[PDB]
C-alpha cells in the first residue's frame, strides 16, 4: 500500500479555479463543534489513496 | 429483528427530517456510501427502505 498521496475528503466549500489549499485544519462534519480535536463527526481532511 | 429475518420498514408519502437525526450523538456509526449526509435534507427520493 502506498499510502504517501493524499486528498482533501472534507471541506466546507468548492475552490476555486487554480486554488490551492493545503491547510491541516480539522472539520466539523456534525452540530457539534471539534475545538481542533477530532472525535464524532471530526475527521481530519486529509485521506490517503490505498 | 434478527438479521436472518431484518424488518423492512417503507417510508413513503411523508416529510423526513434527516437533521434530527444526523444531529443525534448517541449513533456510533453514521457512514453513507452513494448520497452525502449534509445533503439528506436537500435531495427528494421516490421511497425509502428501512
Do not use: H, M
Request: proline share 4%; net charge positive.
Amino acid at each position: 500500500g502506498n499510502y504517501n498521496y493524499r486528498y482533501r475528503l472534507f471541506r466546507k466549500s468548492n475552490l476555486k479555479p487554480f486554488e490551492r489549499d493545503i491547510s491541516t485544519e480539522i472539520y466539523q462534519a456534525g452540530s457539534t463543534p471539534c475545538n481542533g480535536v477530532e472525535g464524532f463527526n471530526c475527521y481530519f481532511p486529509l485521506q490517503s489513496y490505498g | 429483528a434478527s438479521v436472518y429475518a431484518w424488518n423492512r420498514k417503507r417510508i413513503s408519502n411523508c416529510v423526513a427530517d434527516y437533521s434530527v437525526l444526523y444531529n443525534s450523538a448517541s449513533f456510533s456509526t453514521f457512514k453513507c456510501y452513494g448520497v452525502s449526509p449534509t445533503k439528506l435534507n436537500d435531495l427528494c427520493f421516490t421511497n425509502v427502505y428501512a
